[PDB]
Amino acid sequence: EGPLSVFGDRSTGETIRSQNVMAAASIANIVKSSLGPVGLDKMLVDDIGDVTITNDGATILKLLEVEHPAAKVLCELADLQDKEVGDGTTSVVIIAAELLKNADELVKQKIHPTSVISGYRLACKEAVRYINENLIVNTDELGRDCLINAAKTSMSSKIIGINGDFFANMVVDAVLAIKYTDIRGQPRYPVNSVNILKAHGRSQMESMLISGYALNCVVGSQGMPKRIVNAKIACLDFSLQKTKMKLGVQVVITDPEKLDQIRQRESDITKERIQKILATGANVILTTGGIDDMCLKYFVEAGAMAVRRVLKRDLKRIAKASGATILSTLANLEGEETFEAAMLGQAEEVVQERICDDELILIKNTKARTSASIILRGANDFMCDEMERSLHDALCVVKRVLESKSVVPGGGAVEAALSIYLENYATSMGSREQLAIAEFARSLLVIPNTLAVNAAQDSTDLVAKLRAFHNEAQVNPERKNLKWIGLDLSNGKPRDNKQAGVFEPTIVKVKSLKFATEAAITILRIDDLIKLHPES
Amino acid sequence: KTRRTLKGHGNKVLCMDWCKDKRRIVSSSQDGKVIVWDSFTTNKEHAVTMPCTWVMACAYAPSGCAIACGGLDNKCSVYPLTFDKNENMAAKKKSVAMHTNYLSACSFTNSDMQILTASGDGTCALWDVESGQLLQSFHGHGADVLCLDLAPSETGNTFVSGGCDKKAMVWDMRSGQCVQAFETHESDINSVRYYPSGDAFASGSDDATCRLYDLRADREVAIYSKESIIFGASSVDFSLSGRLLFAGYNDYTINVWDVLKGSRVSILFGHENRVSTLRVSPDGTAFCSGSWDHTLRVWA
Amino acid sequence: GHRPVLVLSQNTKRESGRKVQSGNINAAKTIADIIRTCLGPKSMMKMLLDPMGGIVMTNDGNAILREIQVQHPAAKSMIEISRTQDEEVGDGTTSVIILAGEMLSVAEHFLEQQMHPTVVISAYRKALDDMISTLKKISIPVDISDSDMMLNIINSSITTKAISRWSSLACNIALDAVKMVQFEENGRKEIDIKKYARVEKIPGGIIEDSCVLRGVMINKDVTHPRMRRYIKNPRIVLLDSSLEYKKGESQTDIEITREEDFTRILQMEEEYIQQLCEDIIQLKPDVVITEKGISDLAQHYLMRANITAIRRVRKTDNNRIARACGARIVSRPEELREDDVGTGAGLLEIKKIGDEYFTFITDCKDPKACTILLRGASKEILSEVERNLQDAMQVCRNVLLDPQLVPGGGASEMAVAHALTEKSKAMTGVEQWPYRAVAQALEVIPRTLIQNCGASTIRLLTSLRAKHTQENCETWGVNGETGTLVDMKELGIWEPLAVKLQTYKTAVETAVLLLRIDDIVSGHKK
Ligand SMILES: Nc1ncnc2c1ncn2[C@@H]1O[C@H](COP(=O)(O)OP(=O)(O)O)[C@@H](O)[C@H]1O
Ligand SMILES: Nc1ncnc2c1ncn2[C@@H]1O[C@H](COP(=O)(O)OP(=O)(O)O)[C@@H](O)[C@H]1O
Ligand SMILES: [Mg+2]
Ligand SMILES: [Mg+2]
């Protein structure tokens, strides 16, 4: 097969370019139907009947089986966007695929790919500059209502979209509750400290935001009390079992009288440790290790609560919230074995609550630090999982809005404004990078077009009206308030989205643009593919 | 006399090893699943999955704090056996061997700082466990090397290795030379095992013959063959007292020999496929041997 | 070779569009139709064949749906919501499935008429909020201290089951068990009937002989025959540690060099057993119950003090015994205390039923755990009786926690439907049509009751709707036996408010979840 003599296939030039564009288009088209408030969820049957109902683009692309390398590039692009921002996962994939498609259309006209790449880089830089200079709103002016509007906008298109009036309040309260400050006065919001527990049963409106922490654990023994009025929480990182000598220690008995004493000590050691821990005044004992029966009996007789096999991250969060100190050993700097009362966490209550035939621990009103947890109620497991994903997206969006106090109008306003501005700007940059920047601007219009199409409306007319509004805003200095005009998908007409409360964090748009440009450049950089035959 | 069975392998059993406490039997299988089940209660103490498949090398440290494994991946790794209950055993992987061919067999030394790897590249290599670098190679067999056994009782700093080179050669780490060589099997070499005294060693071959060599005379001592047995032996071992020559065979059965006489003392069977490994428990009370029949039954 | 190039892996199908929505709605409707004929007092039993070889004669919807394997994921969602309804409230499992099927069936009509599913979902959620409001409005309070009302509620809960024949006995058993299990500690009310209300099925006898014990029952016998099988007022000591001699945790080896060391070690093993037994005896108990084995020498030492021992009892049974007799399970007998000794069991009886020995700790005073003894024709009959008793106990717990009641027999459905229809007249947008569609789709319950009874559906529903259009007629429903319109103030069929709220919520939310769904993708591996 020719003189090259390689054990594999080879596609060169237009063939491989069209293949890559087709793969990117396929990945885009899989998730294109789940964009905007009029988007719809998707089932993903997992070859064994496992069902996953989701609208999140990252989840859809992660669950799918993808073989083409460019399709992979898009899938990991979505995953990166989800990891580093948390929202806009579908938008970034759609934008990247459209950028690649238009770039290849340019290349097929004998425009060199280097010129297209240079134009794309210039367009991305200028788009980011324009967004940061003209299309941002300072959230300090709008107060707390801006956070509520941002959360509601993020939760549209999700299974909790209609219930936004309630879910946004819950999300904002949780995020504000888990807020903590560090050195140099920077306020940071450590999301993933909001433990999210799923349990089917009652309606969505009956989901609870715990003013404390929620453990997916129960008491180790039925004999313990299941409620403590004033909790003295002690956190341990070691198991409470019958102590056994380690690998380097052996028990050899020559005088048989010592065997009974040795066997007694074998459990008296743990008994003494538990006696110290109880004598310091502790009421609730949480440990990451196991607890066998005799230790449970000690806790039962002491009238205390003991929980075993607590997750390490859960234990860390509880210790941080209640002011407790994690202990891996009961050893001090004096070489002795003591437990001090100064390392006891406190809380206003610990309850063995029951949630839909199953029980869980509620640690309410931990002192010295405020913590939050959310228990989601739904019809079944799949719906609860989708609720959890949507809730995580909302939490991430609120965290971004709080950390960076800039938001941008939603509903395709930014895309239309950028398209108009970049189309005007391309005329003063080179000769072929002109075409590259024009195609970048045209590709940015795929978002409002997809939004309008998903609502079964005239996409062309709506996008034309939006472009006319934004052109008038950019041309007439006195009409600069038209930049906020976006799309009203319920009525299919242009609407001032800033007044409507449709906001997104600026970081979402900026990072999506940068990542889409980089992925498009990477794919456009390929003009030849060699696929070696597998050796299996 | 089979007393228990061990059904914990998805594919055929390739090799196994014992422990000094007689409770930490480890093994390797075709799939790449390694289990360290207890010897008595037949319960998996702890298990790990090798990322590759076709692994027939597995050794157990005399101290018991680590295990080694390897196969067609051209790789030998050390898995420490520290307690560390809240840990995945794949994280503590330690890649050691840089081999250009499949690893036929690996073994520890009495001190858990060296491992000897016999591979299909025709060379046996010595690796320092701690530092992880190659100690010294052993140029030798012009073909694949299959078996590898360390001497007991100081090892004499010596070990023997055999393969399809038609000969078994004794080496010396203190000088890195083939001090002794024996070429009398007329077939492929499969297994080798030192006599308990350490001055002799038996070897199984594909000609269904078991041969005993005495290092104090440099000549074969006793032939162990029968016209009934036509399938080559795959494993061989000695009794603790040194009077029996437990040997594994591909005839689905196990042939028992007498070191002094070799007069067909007994025979046992039970496996539904080829026997791949056969090791004697350190206490000498009982023994065990796996097979390709997916089982690793134990005889007492 | 030149293998084909493709984006997604092979065997990765993908559907989209109107076909997906129609298929989902059809799957839900099929699931509903499977158990449609199992609703009401005149429901027909269904006979299921377990893959392991068992037979499940049942009428409960959840059991039927959990014994059925399906491939369409919408059917899987329906099975999951049935399980959710069964776990959350305990009954209403076949009502919620029918309701969800009907709402999806009426939503398909709007999907086919160029209406986006988001509008339908918004209308559904508004309708659900108004249903909750109306149901809370038409509810009535109930005195939980009145035994007659409790028995009547449980009866209305079990008139539709196979235990309707012995309804009186069933209601008494369920009420007594639920009231007995109810417990309060540290200011925390608790009704744990899944743990401390055990149902034991012994085939044979007559179902009229089945009764709830004032104590517990286990399938255990005395370890040694010499032990007494009848103690009047036993002091019970519970253990979860072996009364044997066992090896320690550390590796321990003895090195014997003198002659007497072997015999001395054996003698000290015996002495250790004797010391444990003496520590047990120091409290002067009458019966010792352990989760782990008791050695023969320990049995001898216990019989020396006239103590009955039970060898190996499960953890849950031991917990129930502790709750019933007021004991406290302890591990090390040397730490045994007087408070841990369980006094309060008024009798310990060990009698033979058939060819097995059963231990009775009945006659307890103020017990917090009960064993429901069921005797009947065979295993399947007793299993169905147990399921009906579970439904009754769940209903009793729901009423105890929520003392509100709503009329049954379809009266609540019609009342809520009429209220929703009247409220829809103010609505002017396009959302009013699906709103009214859900309102009248709520009417499937009385329609199914009338269909099962065998009467004419069209005229009965028309007359019932006409009656409900009047002012004070929220309690007018149908008879499931005579197929006539009656007043539940006279018929006496009432249901807990919590059950109806959960049913409506689950149905509407299942409809919303399946309406949100499009573009099914399948075939991908893990
Ligand atoms: N209420 C609303 N009205 C109009 N447009 C909206 C509204 N809510 C969200 N959008 C727009 O829908 C687009 C799609 O967002 P979505 O697809 O949910 O995010 P992701 O891409 O992370 O899944 C966003 O760009 C946003 O501007
Ligand atoms: N005597 C009766 N007359 C008319 N309807 C009744 C009567 N008893 C119960 N019902 C109705 O039958 C339904 C109960 O049927 P059931 O099989 O328990 O369904 P589910 O399993 O969903 O609870 C209730 O909706 C109730 O209104
Ligand atoms: Mg989003
Ligand atoms: Mg019922």
**In what helix (H) or strand (E) does residue B160 lie, and over which residues does it extend?**
strand B159-163
Q: Which residue, C1, C525, C523, C7, is CA-closest to A69?
A: C7
CB contact under 8 A, B64 and A288: no
Q: Tell how far the Cα of C411 is from the centroid of ligand 2, in angstroms.
A: 11
**Residues forming beta bridges with residue A231, ordered by sequence position:** A347
Q: Which candidate, C418, C305, C323, C420, places its Cα nearest to that of C364?
A: C323
Measured CA angle at A533 (ends A530, A536), to 5 deg = 150
Q: Which candidate in A54, A59, A89, A366 is catalytic?
A: A89
User: How many Å apart are CA C65 and CA C467, to the nearest integer?
Assistant: 35
Q: Name the residue with the closest Cα to ligand 1, atom 20.
A: A88
Within 13 Å, how many C-alpha atoms sit on residue B258's CB side? 7
Distance CA A387, CA A393 (A): 10
CB atoms closer than 10 angstroms to residue C154: 25
Q: Contact, B46 vs B89, CB < 8 A?
A: yes
Cβ(A459)–Cβ(A481) below 8 Å: no
H helices present in C200-295, as ranges: 261-281
Distance separating alpha carbons of residues A409 and A395, to the nearest angstrom = 19
Closest ligand to C-alpha of residue C502 is 2
Interval between CA A197 and ligand 4 midpoint (Å): 30
CB < 8 Å to A223, chain C: 322, 328-329
- H/E stretch holding C511: helix C497-515
User: Which of C193, C509, C514, C526 is best to mutate for the A interface (most A CBs within 10 A)?
Assistant: C509
Q: Using CA atoms, how far apart are residues A269 and C333, in angstroms rounded to an integer?
A: 17
* Window C:55-94, CB contacts with A under 8 Å: 71, 73, 76-77, 80-81, 83-84, 87-88
Q: Is the CB of C493 under 6 A from ligand 2?
A: yes
Classify residue A182 by its DSSP letter.
-
Q: Is the CA virtual torsion C98, C103, C106, C109 positive or negative?
A: negative
CA distance C100 to C506: 8
Task: State the Cα–Cα distance between residues C319 and B34, nearest whole angstrom.
Answer: 40
CA A436 to CA A119: how far, in whole Å?
5
Query: Percentages helix, strand, coil for chain B, rounded to the nearest 5?
Result: 0, 40, 60
Q: In this structure, which ligand is nearest to the CA of C38? A: 2
Structure token pair of residue C507:
């149905």
Nearest CA among A71, A72, A55, A78 for reference residue A515: A78
- Residue whose entry in the numeric block shows the structure tokens 């890649």: B95
Radius of gyration for the alpha carbons in chain B, expressed in angstroms and rounded:
18
CA gap A149, A346 in Å, rounded = 36
Asked whether the beta carbons of C406 and C135 are under 8 A apart, the reply is yes
The closest alpha carbon to A284, from A319, A334, A330, A332, belongs to A319
CA A402, CA A208: separation in Å to the nearest integer?
A: 23
Provide the residue count of chain B: 300
Tell me whether strands A42-45 and C521-522 are parallel, antiparallel or unpaired. Answer: parallel
**Which atom number of ligand 2 is nearest to the Cα of residue C477?**
4
| Sign of the CA dihedral running C360, C366, C370, C376 | positive
Look up residue C461 and give its two tokens.
């529903």
Cα–Cα distance between C319 and A220 in angstroms, integer?
Answer: 13
DSSP state letter for C60: -
Tell me the residue length of chain C: 526
The CA C395 to ligand 4 mean position distance, Å, reads 9
Q: What is the dihedral of CA B138, B142, B148, B150, to 10 degrees?
A: -40
Method: cryo-EM
CB-CB neighbors (< 8 A) of B53 in chain A: none
Ligand 1 centroid distance, CA of A460 (Å): 19
Nearest chain B residue to A309, by CA = B86
H helices of A178-256, where? Answer: none
Q: How far apart are CA A373 and CA A192, in angstroms?
A: 10
**Residue numbers in C near A456 (CB within 8 A):** 114, 116
Nearest CB to C88: which of A30, A163, A201?
A201
* Cα–Cα separations (whole angstroms), residue A328 to A288, A468, B34, C415: 10, 66, 31, 62
Q: Whose CA is closest to A103, among A12, A20, A11, A10?
A: A20
Which of A351, A357, A379 lies closest to C506 in CB terms? A379
Q: How far is residue A230's CA from residue C107's CA, in Å, rounded to a whole number?
A: 52
Q: Are strands C370-376 and C287-290 parallel, antiparallel or unpaired?
A: unpaired
Q: Is C131 in the pocket of ligand 2 (CB under 6 A)?
A: no
CA pair distance C509, A202, nearest whole angstrom: 10
Q: Which three-class secondary structure state does DSSP give residue C357? A: strand
Q: Which of A41, A54, A82, A90 is catalytic?
A: A90
Ligand nearest to the CA of A447: 1
Which residues, 6 or more positions from B126, have their beta carbon under 8 angstroms from its beta carbon? B114, B115, B116, B117, B134, B135, B136, B137, B138, B173
Task: Copy the structure tokens of residue A247.
Answer: 């690998």
A89 is a catalytic site residue:
yes
The label of the residue with tokens 């009025």 reads A229
Ligand 4 centre distance from Cα of residue C156 (Å): 8
* A112: DSSP letter: -
Among candidate residues A54, A64, A61, A62, the one with its CA nearest the CA of residue A34 = A54
Neighbouring-strand partners of residue C370? C197
Mutation site, C21, C86, C118, C330, interface A, largest A CB count within 10 A: C118
Token digits for B200? 């002799």
Residue C476 pairs in a beta bridge with C487
Residue C26 backbone dihedrals phi, psi, to 5 degrees: -65, -40
The identity of residue C407, as a single letter, is P
> Environment class of residue A312 by beta-carbon count within 10 Å: exposed (0-12), middle (13-18) or buried (19+)?
exposed
Resolution (A): 2.9
d(CA B59, CA B239) in angstroms, rounded, equals 19
Chain C segment 487-506 residues within 8 A of A by beta carbon are 502, 505-506
- Taking each continuous run of H as one helix and of E as one strand, the counts in chain C are 18, 21
Helix (H) or strand (E) holding C154: helix C147-158
Q: Which of B10, B4, B102, B94 is nearest to B47 (CA)?
A: B10
Closest alpha carbon to B209 in B197, B225, B221, B194: B225
CA distances from C194 to B280, C276, C384 (A): 52, 35, 17
Q: Tell me how crowded residue A133 is: count the other CB atoms within 10 A of its CB.
A: 8
- Which of A42, A49, A65 is nearest residue C518 as measured by Cβ atoms? A42
Provide the CA A225 distance to its chain's centre, in angstroms: 37
Active site residue A59: no
* C446 CA distance to ligand 4 middle (Å): 14
CB pairs under 8 A between A and C: 226
- C481 labeled part of a ligand binding site: yes
Q: Which atom of ligand 1 is nearest to the CA of A410?
A: 27
- Is A98 buried (19+), middle (13-18) or exposed (0-12) by CB count in 10 A? buried
Cβ atoms within 10 A of the Cβ of A186, count? 8
DSSP-derived letter for residue A159 is: T
Contact between B64 and A247 using a beta-carbon 8 Å cutoff: yes
CB of C95 within 6 A of ligand 2: the answer is: yes
B62 in contact with A at a CB cutoff of 8 Å?
no
Three-state secondary-structure class, residue A310: coil
Q: Is B107 helix (H, G, I), strand (E, B) or coil?
A: strand
Pocket test for ligand 2, best of C38, C88, C493, C501 (most atoms within 8 A of CB): C493
Query: Residue A532 is encoded by which pair of tokens?
Result: 């070696």
The identity of residue A145, as a single letter, is: D
Contact A247 B65 (CB under 8 A): yes
Q: Looking at CA atoms only, how far is residue A222 from chain B in angstroms?
A: 26
What would you report as the CA-atom Rg of chain C, rounded to the nearest whole angstrom?
A: 30
What is the bridge-based pairing of β-strands B233-236 and B247-249? antiparallel
Neighboring chain C residues of A352 at a CB cutoff of 8 Å: 188
Residue with tokens 């999806």: C104
Give the closest residue to A396 by CA, choosing from A183, A53, A104, A82: A82
**Tokens encoding C177:** 């068990």
Strand-pairing partners, residue C212, are C372
Helix runs in A85-217, H state only: 89-107, 113-134, 139-142, 144-155, 164-177
Q: Quote the tokens at residue C267.
A: 């003698």
- 3 state SS of B71: strand
Q: CA of C124: which chain A residue's CA is closest?
A: A162
Bridge partners of B145, per DSSP, are B163
What is the token pair recorded at A321?
Answer: 């919230």
> Do the Cβ atoms of A247 and B86 come within 8 Å?
no
Question: C: neighbours with 3+ CB pairs under 8 Å?
Answer: A
Q: What gap in Å lies between CA A62 and CA C454, rounded to an integer?
A: 53
C296 alpha carbon to ligand 1 midpoint, in Å?
74
A interface mutation test: which of C5, C6, C7 has the most A CBs within 10 A?
Answer: C7
* Residue A85 to residue A64: CA distance in whole angstroms: 21
Using CA atoms, how far apart are residues A178 and A173, in angstroms rounded to an integer? 9
Indicate the helix (H) or strand (E) that contains A212. strand A212-215
Asked if residues B145 and B123 have their Cβ atoms less than 8 Å apart, the reply is yes
Q: What residues contact A470, with CB distance under 8 A and at least 6 apart?
A: A413, A416, A417, A419, A420, A482, A483, A485
- The CA-CA-CA angle for residues A160, A166, A171, to 5°, reads 80
Which of A65, A222, A260 has the CB atom closest to C272's CB atom?
A: A260
| C-alpha neighbours within 13 Å on the C-beta side of residue A392 | 21
In Å, how far are B150, B169, B180 from B140, measured between CA atoms? 17, 8, 12
Chain A CB within 8 Å of residue C121 CB? yes
Q: Which residues on A lie below 8 Å from C254 (Cβ)?
A: 252-254, 256, 259
- The string over A425-436, giving b where at least 16 C-beta atoms fall within 10 Å of a residue's C-beta and e elsewhere, is bbeebeebbbbb
Is A405 annotated as ligand-binding? no
How do beta strands A251-253 and C252-254 pair?
parallel
Residues near B41 by beta carbon (within 8 Å), at least 6 away in sequence? none
Under a CB-based contact definition with an 8 Å cutoff, are residues A419 and A447 in contact? Answer: no
Q: What are the φ/ψ torsions at residue A191 (nearest 5 degrees)?
A: -65, 165
As to burial, measured by CB atoms within 10 angstroms (0-12 exposed, 13-18 middle, 19+ buried), residue B241 is: exposed
